[PDB]
C-alpha cells in the first residue's frame, strides 16, 4: 500500500494519456454533414393498466409482442401488447421486485429484488399454471438487474457490487464478476452474448467477458451513479444513463467519450436507457416524468414522451423496433409508436 | 374477433377478477418500513409486537401484526450493505417509517440524527411520515442519573436547555431525566419541523423494552397519518 497507490495512480495517468492520444476528432465534427432526425412525434398507441403499486421493471419479448412487467405490489404480469390482454399474472413471494427479464426463447421469466433471490418462473408447463422453476440465492445484496443469456444461463447484478453468471439447471452460481466498488445498478448483454457491460453506483461502467469473467474494460466518464446501460445494436458501443442528468455514449475497442446527451434545463437523473432499431435514436427516461428522445449521432433532443405522472423507472424497445414501452411509478405502461 | 381471440379476452377477464381480489388485500394492509441502527432495540421491538399480536441471506424480513382488526406489514432490512442510497427508494409508498433510536448511548446519537436528516430530506422519501421511537428510556435514566456521561460533551446546547412547559412529566421521574429525554426529542423535532411544510409529520415516542403499547402507538400514528393525507386531498391542510 506504500507504493501500490502511487503505481495505480501513475498507471491510470498512462491509460488516460493513451486514451487522449487515441482521440483524433470527436463525434461532433464527424457527424456534422448528417441531416437532423427531424422532430420526431410519437403518441401513446397503447395504455396498459392493472398494476396496483409502482411499475418498477419491464422487459420486451423477442417476438416484440409479449412484454413482462414487474411492479412493487409483488406482481409480475405478461401483457400481449397488440390486444392489451394480460397473460400469466404471476404472484411473487417477496413484494419488493426490482428487476424482471424475459427469456429469449420465451419459456422463462426472471424476477429478483430486495429478497436477494432471483426467481425463474417456467411459463410453459404441463400443469398449466405458472410456478417458480428455480430460486437462485447466492447474492448478499439486492438484485438490481438480470438478463437471460441462453435460456439456461442468467447474468444477475446485485447490490453487493458483484455480478453473477448462474446455471439454472443446477441452481449454482457458475461465475462471479467482481471489481465494482459500488453496487451494480444495471447490466446489458451484447448481441452475440459473448460480452456484457455493467453500470454500478460509481462513476464507471465495466465491460466483462461471460466466458471467464476477467473484466476487459472500464469506462470512467460519468460523475454520479449509473442507473441504466444498453449496447448499441451493432455491439461496438453502449450508452449509459447516470444520476447527474446526463447520458454518455461510450464505444468499445476505443475506450473513449463519443457523445454527451444533456441539456441545461435538465437536472433530474437518468433512469432508463434504450436504443432504436438502427441506433439512431436514444430513448432516455428521466425523473421529471419524461422520456426525452435524443439523436444519437448529433446529440440534440428529438422528441419528448409525456403522459406519465411519476418517474418512468423502466423502458424498452422491441426487437424489431416497431414500438417503445415505458413503465412508470404511477403503475401504468405506455406503448408508443 | 376469432374464436381464439375470444378465449384470450375471456382468460384476461378471469385474470382481471383475480387482480381485483388482490387489490382488496393490498389496500387493506398498511406497509411500514422499520429503520434503526444496531444499538437500537429494533429486534426487541419486533419480537415484542410479534409475540403480542399474531433464509440465510434474506435482504428483507417481514412481520405482519393485526391491531383493532387492521393489519400492518412491517419490513426491516436484513442482509443488505450499509449503503442505503438505492434500495431506500423502494419504500416511497409506505404508510410510515418507524425510526427506532437508542436514546441511551451518545457515541452514535448524532449518527442517528444524521440518518433521520437524510431520510427526512429525500426527494423520493418526502410525503412520508416517520413514527420516531426513542427506545430504551430506562437505560438513559440510569445513565443520566449516575452523572458519569455529560450531555454537553456531545451536544453543547444541552447546557442552555430547559424542559418545555408543554412537556408532560412522568411520575417518579427525576427532573434531569425528563430534561435530557425532552432534549433528545426536541433535537430530533428540530430537524423534523424544518422542511416538511405539512407534507409529512413526525410522531416521537418514549418507548421502552418492558412496555407493550408500541403496537397501539403505531396504530394511532398511522390513523393520524391517513387522516392527514385525506385532509390534504381536500387541500384542507
Amino acid at each position, epitope marked *: 500500500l506504500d507504493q501500490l497507490r502511487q503505481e495505480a495512480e501513475q498507471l491510470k495517468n498512462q491509460i488516460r494519456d493513451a486514451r487522449k492520444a487515441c482521440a483524433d476528432a470527436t463525434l461532433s465534427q464527424i457527424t456534422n454533414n448528417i441531416d437532423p432526425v427531424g422532430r420526431i412525434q410519437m403518441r401513446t398507441r397503447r395504455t396498459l393498466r392493472g398494476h396496483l403499486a409502482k411499475i418498477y421493471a419491464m422487459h420486451w419479448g423477442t417476438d416484440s409482442r409479449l412484454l413482462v412487467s414487474a411492479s412493487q405490489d409483488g406482481k409480475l404480469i405478461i401483457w400481449d401488447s397488440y390486444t392489451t390482454n394480460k397473460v400469466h399474472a404471476i404472484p411473487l413471494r417477496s413484494s419488493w421486485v426490482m428487476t424482471c427479464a424475459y427469456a429469449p426463447s420465451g419459456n422463462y421469466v426472471a424476477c429478483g429484488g430486495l429478497d436477494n433471490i432471483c426467481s425463474i418462473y417456467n411459463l410453459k408447463t404441463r400443469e398449466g399454471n405458472v410456478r417458480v422453476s428455480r430460486e437462485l440465492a447466492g447474492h448478499t445484496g439486492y438484485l438490481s438487474c438480470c438478463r437471460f443469456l441462453d435460456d439456461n444461463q442468467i447474468v444477475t447484478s446485485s447490490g453487493d457490487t458483484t455480478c453473477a453468471l448462474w446455471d439454472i439447471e443446477t441452481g449454482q452460481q457458475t461465475t462471479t464478476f467482481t471489481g465494482h466498488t459500488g453496487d451494480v445498478m444495471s447490466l446489458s448483454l451484447a448481441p452475440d452474448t459473448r460480452l456484457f457491460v455493467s453500470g454500478a453506483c460509481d462513476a464507471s461502467a465495466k465491460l466483462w467477458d461471460v466466458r471467464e469473467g476477467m473484466c476487459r474494460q472500464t469506462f*470512467t466518464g460519468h460523475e454520479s451513479d449509473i442507473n441504466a446501460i444498453c449496447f448499441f445494436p451493432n455491439g461496438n458501443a453502449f450508452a449509459t444513463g447516470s444520476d447527474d442528468a446526463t447520458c454518455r455514449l461510450f464505444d468499445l475497442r476505443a475506450d473513449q467519450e463519443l457523445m454527451t446527451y444533456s441539456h441545461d434545463n435538465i437536472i433530474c437523473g437518468i433512469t432508463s436507457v434504450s436504443f432504436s432499431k438502427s441506433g439512431r435514436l436514444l430513448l432516455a427516461g428521466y425523473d421529471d416524468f419524461n422520456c426525452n428522445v435524443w439523436d444519437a449521432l448529433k446529440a440534440d433532443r428529438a422528441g419528448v414522451l409525456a403522459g406519465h405522472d411519476n418517474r418512468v423507472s423502466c423502458l424498452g424497445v422491441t426487437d424489431d423496433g416497431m414500438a417503445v414501452a415505458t413503465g412508470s411509478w404511477d403503475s401504468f405502461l405506455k406503448i408508443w409508436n | 374477433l376469432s374464436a381464439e381471440d375470444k378465449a384470450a379476452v375471456e382468460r384476461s377477464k378471469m385474470i382481471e377478477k383475480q387482480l381485483q381480489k388482490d387489490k382488496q388485500v393490498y389496500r387493506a394492509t398498511h406497509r411500514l418500513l422499520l429503520l434503526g441502527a444496531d444499538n437500537s432495540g429494533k429486534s426487541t421491538i419486533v419480537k415484542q409486537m410479534r409475540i403480542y399480536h399474531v433464509v440465510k441471506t434474506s435482504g428483507i424480513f417481514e412481520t405482519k401484526f393485526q391491531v383493532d382488526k387492521v393489519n400492518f406489514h412491517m419490513f426491516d432490512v436484513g442482509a443488505q450493505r450499509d449503503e442505503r442510497r438505492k434500495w431506500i427508494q423502494c419504500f416511497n409508498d409506505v404508510t410510515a417509517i418507524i425510526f427506532v433510536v437508542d436514546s441511551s448511548d451518545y457515541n452514535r446519537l448524532q449518527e442517528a440524527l444524521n440518518d433521520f436528516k437524510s431520510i427526512w430530506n429525500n426527494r423520493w422519501l418526502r410525503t412520508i411520515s416517520v413514527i420516531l421511537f426513542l427506545n430504551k428510556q430506562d437505560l438513559l435514566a440510569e445513565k443520566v442519573l449516575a452523572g458519569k456521561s455529560k450531555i454537553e460533551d456531545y451536544f453543547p446546547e444541552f447546557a442552555r436547555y430547559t424542559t418545555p412547559e408543554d412537556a408532560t412529566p412522568e411520575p417518579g421521574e427525576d427532573p434531569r431525566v425528563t430534561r435530557a429525554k425532552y432534549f433528545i426529542r426536541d433535537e430530533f423535532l428540530r430537524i423534523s419541523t424544518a422542511s416538511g411544510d405539512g407534507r409529512h409529520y413526525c410522531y416521537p415516542h418514549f418507548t421502552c423494552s418492558v412496555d407493550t403499547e408500541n403496537a397501539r402507538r403505531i396504530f394511532n400514528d398511522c390513523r393520524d397519518i391517513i387522516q392527514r393525507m385525506h385532509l390534504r386531498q381536500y387541500e384542507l391542510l
Partner: nanobody
Amino acid sequence: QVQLQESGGGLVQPGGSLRLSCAASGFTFSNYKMNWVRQAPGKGLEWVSDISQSGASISYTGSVKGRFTISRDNAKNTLYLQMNSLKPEDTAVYYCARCPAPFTRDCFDVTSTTYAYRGQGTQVTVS
C-alpha cells in the same frame, strides 16, 4: 473520473490549528454538497461537517461546534476545513466526501464503508 485529493494535516500540539484542503476533479463542484468525515482508530466513520452548494447551509457535529469551520471555493474547485483548536481526542483519518445525486438536500451513506465518492483521506495526530 471523480477524484478527491486531501492535503494537509499531521502531527500537531493539542491546541494548534490545521487547514485541510480537498481538491476535487471529474465533476462539477458547484452542483454538489461537500462533506467532511472522520474515522478514529477503532471507532469507525463519523460525520464531522458538511456545506451545501455555494455555502449558506454550513453545519457541524456537536463535538466541533465552536472549533471547526468549513468553506468552499467553486472557482478553485476546492473544499477547506479550518481547525482552530485541536484536542487529543479528535485524532483520526479525515475524509473529504461528496454527496451523490447533485441538486439534493439529503446525503446518504457518506459514513458507510467503501463509499465511492470519498477521498483517500489524511491523517491528523494530536499529541
